[PDB]
Structure formats: structure tokens, C-alpha cells
Amino acid sequence: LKNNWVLLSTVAAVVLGITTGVLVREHSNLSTLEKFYFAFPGEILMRMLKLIILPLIISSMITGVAALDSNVSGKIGLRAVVYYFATTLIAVILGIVLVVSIKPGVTSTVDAMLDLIRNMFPENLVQAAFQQYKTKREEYKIVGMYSDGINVLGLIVFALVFGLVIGKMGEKGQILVDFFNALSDATMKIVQIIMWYMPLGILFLIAGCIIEVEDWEIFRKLGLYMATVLTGLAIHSIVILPLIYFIVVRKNPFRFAMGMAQALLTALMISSSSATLPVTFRCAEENNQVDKRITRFVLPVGATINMDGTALYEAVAAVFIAQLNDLDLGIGQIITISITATSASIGAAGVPQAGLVTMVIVLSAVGLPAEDVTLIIAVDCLLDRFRTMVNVLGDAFGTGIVEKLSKKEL
Ligand SMILES: N[C@@H](CCC(=O)O)C(=O)O
Ligand SMILES: [Hg+2]
Ligand code: NA
Ligand code: NA
Ligand code: NA
């Protein structure tokens, strides 16, 4: 179909990469260095996508907050925050219920929960643009250290405050608001340029992902672990979120979901929600006909907070080892895993290796060794390419609901 060139090219690249991964792996053998060199275009595409995160997040968030009126912004943010909280709680509850029902497992926390508050208020803005803050205790004195990795939470709250102040100032801040308004358009144009090269990177990324698997034995060893996660994802994406859309807005959500499936394909191939955010803009804001200010406000905050699938994974995979590691279920034990998983879901970054570093917190919450990550770690990657879809749907669904709630004020 004409005018669907991007979607058709992405589908063709995906199927070609799947064919390459299923063919070249069994008809040849490559060393680890050759496997690394095979996925070089995918690495270049990832790097190009990560390059655009810094100027897009701040510009879009500042524009979204300063575009609205002085009083409407606080109320809209309140609805968005409460929506995110309810969705995360529902996701954790559903994941816990499923992992407990299927029971597939038959066969330093106070210094990490405080790091979120220490990261929301960075000491230096330029350092927070490319570095994070991590604290450790040693003999027992608290020692601070700065590690590499872009800080998104502190930047996001800084954009919140800056946009609110600029909107309050009014005429004096007009130059500063037009600057970021132009920056947002320039960044969107750059993302549109990257769209041209993205299919080839997607093809090579999929091929490299299929190649790196070892013997397919881990598929059978931890098959139930994949099954519970996929069932939870399907339930959360088909039964709960469409239900809330239909209850709030008397429209069918399936056309809304299917129209923007290109963002789903891109995110699922690149296994990242923060990096796919510009694609989420390009799809939702110009296909589902949602307000620009709403998408420039709800999506940036929900890109790092609305991580439903992450929280579901924390819950299911923590109760998995709670069953496996010579332990039994506990009533208050379920509650502490739910709370810790919610906090880690709020506390996790938008990178494909996330969900493991924040996993240690919820593993130690129930008093278990930190070395149990090596259990599901083998399939932990192959599966993390499936936790972003529900995040993208959650943000897109939230945009329409918050638009409907505040239609009069818009
Ligand atoms: N890949 C996830 C981040 C959390 C995780 O990897 O577990 C996302 O983009 O939403
Ligand atoms: Hg992978
Ligand atoms: Na959520
Ligand atoms: Na998200
Ligand atoms: Na998070």
C-alpha cells in the first residue's frame, strides 16, 4: 500500500533479519568476535538513537509544560501521575497473581531507594547530562561516587520546574519558549532523517539477537518463565488497558493501537522505551490525532515512570526464585516484593540492560543472594525485547484519557 512505505520496509527488514538469524546460524559457525562484528550496523543505529535522547527529552518536556496555562498544568500532571500509579499497581498485582497461580518454580535496599531522591536533584546539570549518582556503604560510612550513564529523572524534573517557571513569567520567557519550540521541531526532523536508515539497523539487530543464542536448551529449561511473562503481558495489553480506554472514552481502542503499530515494531526490535519515544511521537501525535501539548507532556514523564512490563517482570521473576530457592510463599513477603518491584520500576532507566541492576534490590528485599540473577539471565535478554510494548501502549492510552478528562480546559 502506498504511503505505508515505512511500515512495509520495517516488516520486510524484520522478516529478512529473522530469516538471516535462522539460516546463517545453523549453516555456519562464527566466533564471539565475528558475532560482535556481525551486529555492527545495529550498534551504529542504537548509538544514533541514543544520541537524540538528550535534546529531545528536555525540549519536548519544556515545550509541553510551558504551552499550557498556569493552573491547568498542575491538575493535568496530577491526573497523569495518578494514572501511572494505578497502572503500575495493577501491573504488579496481575503479575503476582499469575506467577502465584502457575507456580512455575516447583522444579543495601535503604541505600538504593534513596538514590532516586538523590538523582532527582543532581549537584551539576552538565554532569547529570551524561553521569549518574550511586552510593555505597563501607567501613560503615556512606561513600558517594559518580558513574557513567545519562540521568533522566533529574533532567525531567528540571524541565518540569523550568517550564512551569517560564510559563509563569509570560512575556519575558517568550524568547526562551520559542527557542525550545524550534529545538523540538529540529529534533523531530533529525529523527525523521534517522527513520530512513533505521530498517537496515533493525534487520542487523534482529540477526545478531538470533545469532547470539547458544543451544536453545535454555528455552526448554525456563519455558514456564517465558510463558507466565507473556501471559501477563497479553492480559495487561488486551484486557485491562483497552477496558480503561473504553470505560473512560466511548471509542474502540483497537484502531488506536493498530494505527501506531510502527512504534511497536521499532521498540520491540530495539528493546527500549526511552529510545523509541521520538517514534512514539511520530506515530501517536500525527496518526491518532492527539494534542501536541498533551503528547509533549504525558509521554516524556511516562517514558521513565510508566514501565508496566518492567514491574510485572520484577514481580513474576522475584516470586519465581522465592519458590525455587528452597523457600515458600509468605503473605507479607508478597507485599514487600510488590512494593519493591514498584519502586524499582520507578527507579529503572530506559536502557535494554535495565531491569537487572534494579532487580538486585527486590532480590535482597526477601533476603536472597545477589548471584541468583544468573538463573533467568540467559533468557533475560531475549525476553527484554518484549517488555517495552506494554509501556508504549500505556503511554499512548494515557494520552487519550488525559485529553478526554481535560477536554474543556484544552
Ligand atoms: N527495556 C525496558 C527497560 C527496563 C528493562 O529493560 O527491564 C524499556 O525500554 O521499557
Ligand atoms: Hg537479545
Ligand atoms: Na504505570
Ligand atoms: Na514507559
Ligand atoms: Na523507572
Report the distance separating Cα 339 and Cα 341, nearest Å: 5
- In contact, 56 and 285? CB cutoff 8 Å: no
**Please, what's the largest Cα pairwise distance for the chain?**
67
Distance from residue 354's CA to the centre of ligand 5 (Å):
9
Residue 44 DSSP label: H
* Grid cell 532480590 in the structure block, residue: 363
Query: 274, 343, 388, 393: which to mutate for ligand 1, most atoms within 8 A of CB?
Result: 388
Q: Rounded to an integer, what is the distance from CA 256 to the centroid of its chain? A: 20
Q: Scanning the structure block, which residue is given the C-alpha cell 484502531?
A: 255
In order, the DSSP letters of 253-300 are HHHHHHHTHHHHHHHHHHT-SSTTHHHHHHHHHHHS---HHHHHHHHH
Domain count of the fold of the chain: 1
Closest by CA position to 305, among listed 82, 103, 122: 82
CA angle 35, 40, 41 (to 5 degrees): 135
Give kind and range of the element (H or E) at residue 137: strand 131-138
SS3 state at 61: helix
Task: Spell 202-240 as b/e; 16+ CB within 10 A means b.
Answer: bbbbbbbbbbbbeeeebeeebebbbebbebbbebbbeeb
Q: In angstroms, rounded to a whole number, what is the distance separating the alpha carbons of residues 191 and 59?
A: 14
- Under DSSP, the state recorded for 130 is T
- Assign 1 to helix, strand or coil: coil
CB-count exposure of residue 348 (10 Å: 0-12, 13-18, 19+): buried
Q: How far apart are CA 156 and CA 149, in angstroms?
A: 15
CATH code, domain carrying 128: 1.10.3860.10
Q: Is the CB of 307 under 6 A from ligand 1?
A: yes
Residues 93, 233, 60, 113: is their CA dihedral positive or negative?
Answer: positive
Method of elucidation: cryo-EM
Scan for cell 480506554, then name that residue.
Answer: 245
CA distance 189 to 301: 22
End-to-end Cα distance, the chain: 35
| Contact partners, residue 403, CB within 8 Å, separation at least 6 | 290, 291, 294, 410
- Cα(294) to ligand 2 centroid in Å equals 33
DSSP conformation class of 373:
G
Element of type H or E holding 8: helix 5-24
φ, ψ at 252 (rounded to 5°): -75, 125
How crowded is residue 169: how many other Cβ atoms within 10 Å of its Cβ? 13
Phi, psi of 80 (to 5 degrees): -65, -45
Whether 65 contacts 160, CB under 8 Å: yes
| DSSP classification of residue 131 | E
Burial of 373 (0-12, 13-18, 19+ CB in 10 A): middle
If residue 144 lies in a helix (H) or strand (E), which one and from where to where? strand 141-148
Measure the CA–CA gap between 294 and 299, rounded to whole angstroms.
Answer: 8
Residue 368 C-alpha from the chain's centroid: 26
Q: Supply the range of the domain harboring residue 334.
A: 4-409
- How far apart, in whole angstroms, are the C-alpha atoms of residue 160 and residue 90? 26
Residue 387 CB less than 6 A away from ligand 1:
yes
Rounded distance between C-alpha atoms, residue 158 and residue 125, angstroms: 9
Ligand 1 pocket, residue 355 CB under 6 Å: yes
Grid coordinates of 212 = 547470539
Pocket mutation for ligand 1, best pick of 373, 391, 392 (most atoms within 8 Å of C-beta): 391
In terms of residues, how long is the chain? Answer: 410
What's the helix, strand, coil split of the chain in %, to 5?
Answer: 75, 5, 25
Between CA 300 and CA 383 the distance in angstroms is: 24
Residue 273 annotated as binding site:
yes
Phi-psi region of 3 (alpha: psi -120 to 50; beta: other; left: phi over 0): left
Name the helix (H) or strand (E) containing 135: strand 131-138
CB 62 within 8 A of CB 181: no
The three cell numbers locating residue 291: 494534542
CA distance 74 to 70: 8
The alpha-carbon radius of gyration of the chain (Å, integer) is: 22
